[PDB]
Amino acid sequence: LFDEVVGAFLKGDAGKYQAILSWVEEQGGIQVLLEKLQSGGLGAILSTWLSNQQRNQSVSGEQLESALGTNAVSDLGQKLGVDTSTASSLLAEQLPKIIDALSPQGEVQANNDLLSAGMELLKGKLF
Ligand code: NA
């Protein structure tokens, strides 16, 4: 336990982005998550993230755990070594920024290989 606790203290939130990326793909891709947000009543909030004119509407960790499901969120928590609530809070901060970044044309290739879609977007800013 000692080395486990010391490691977690020293690491902080390092590697959160790799974890989220891997988790998105393990859950079946960004499109699965989009559909869950939509079926879970967060379609209007999601529409503000997709828009290329509007500011992202805030969402709570609880709202995301509700829409995405406890198992899905716990899957990310497990990858990070943290509890489900900490994982939902991480997603509440980062997921809107991720979805916004993936939709410069107002919709979200992101679904087939996320890292590849991300690399194209990064390179677009360098082009
Ligand atoms: Na789980």
Side-chain angles (χ1 to χ4, degrees):
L1 304 168
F2 174 87
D3 262 53
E4 192 171 1
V5 174
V6 171
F9 172 82
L10 296 177
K11 180 166 200 175
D13 70 358
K16 63 185 185 193
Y17 295 118
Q18 185 55 65
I20 291 166
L21 276 32
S22 289
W23 167 83
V24 168
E25 303 282 70
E26 290 178 330
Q27 297 298 305
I30 194 67
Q31 194 52 40
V32 172
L33 297 184
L34 294 173
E35 215 307 278
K36 289 185 154 186
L37 293 175
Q38 286 170 334
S39 296
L42 292 180
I45 288 170
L46 170 60
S47 74
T48 72
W49 307 346
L50 292 173
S51 175
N52 56 27
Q53 202 180 175
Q54 295 150 220
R55 277 185 86 104
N56 295 341
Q57 189 165 340
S58 166
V59 66
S60 72
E62 312 88 86
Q63 280 177 309
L64 288 182
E65 195 188 342
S66 285
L68 296 183
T70 297
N71 291 357
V73 180
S74 174
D75 289 345
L76 176 62
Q78 291 169 220
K79 223 171 194 68
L80 298 166
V82 307
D83 63 285
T84 297
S85 177
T86 296
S88 76
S89 288
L90 171 66
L91 288 169
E93 173 176 355
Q94 303 299 342
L95 192 61
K97 299 181 161 92
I98 289 163
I99 292 171
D100 167 65
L102 292 169
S103 55
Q105 70 277 28
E107 58 171 10
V108 169
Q109 161 126 162
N111 201 43
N112 194 244
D113 195 62
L114 195 48
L115 173 68
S116 284
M119 178 67 43
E120 289 179 347
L121 285 153
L122 169 58
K123 287 174 172 182
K125 295 197 178 209
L126 304 182
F127 184 86

